[PDB]
Amino acid sequence: VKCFNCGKEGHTARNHRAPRKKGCWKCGKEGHQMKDCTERQ
Ligand SMILES: [Zn+2]
Ligand SMILES: [Zn+2]
């Protein structure tokens, strides 16, 4: 139930990640995620 410590069930109970999409949720890159991607923001 608790993902490592927070509590969300779909938050990977190991590193608390994978919130939405595997790429950058906007650029489609794997090197970085959605919080580490500018893409003309
Ligand atoms: Zn959580
Ligand atoms: Zn990106």
State how far the Cα of 38 lies from the Cα of 9, in Å rounded to an integer. Answer: 28
Q: How far is the CA of 9 from the centre of ligand 2 (A)?
A: 26
30 Cβ contact partners less than 8 Å away, ≥ 6 residues apart = 22, 23
State how far the Cα of 33 lies from the Cα of 17, in Å rounded to an integer. Answer: 10
State how far the Cα of 34 lies from the Cα of 1, in Å rounded to an integer. Answer: 25
Nearest ligand by distance to the CA of 5 = 1
Q: How far is the CA of 6 from the centre of ligand 2 (A)?
A: 26
Per-domain residue ranges of the chain: 1-41
Q: 5-30 burial by CB neighbour count: b if 16+ within 10 A, else e?
A: eeeeeebeeeeeeeeeeeebeebeee
Q: How far is the CA of 14 from the centre of ligand 2 (A)?
A: 23
The correct answer on CATH 2.60.120.380 for the domain covering 1-41 is no
Pair of tokens at residue 5: 């410590």
Q: What is the rounded radius of gyration, in angstroms, for the C-alpha atoms of the chain?
A: 12
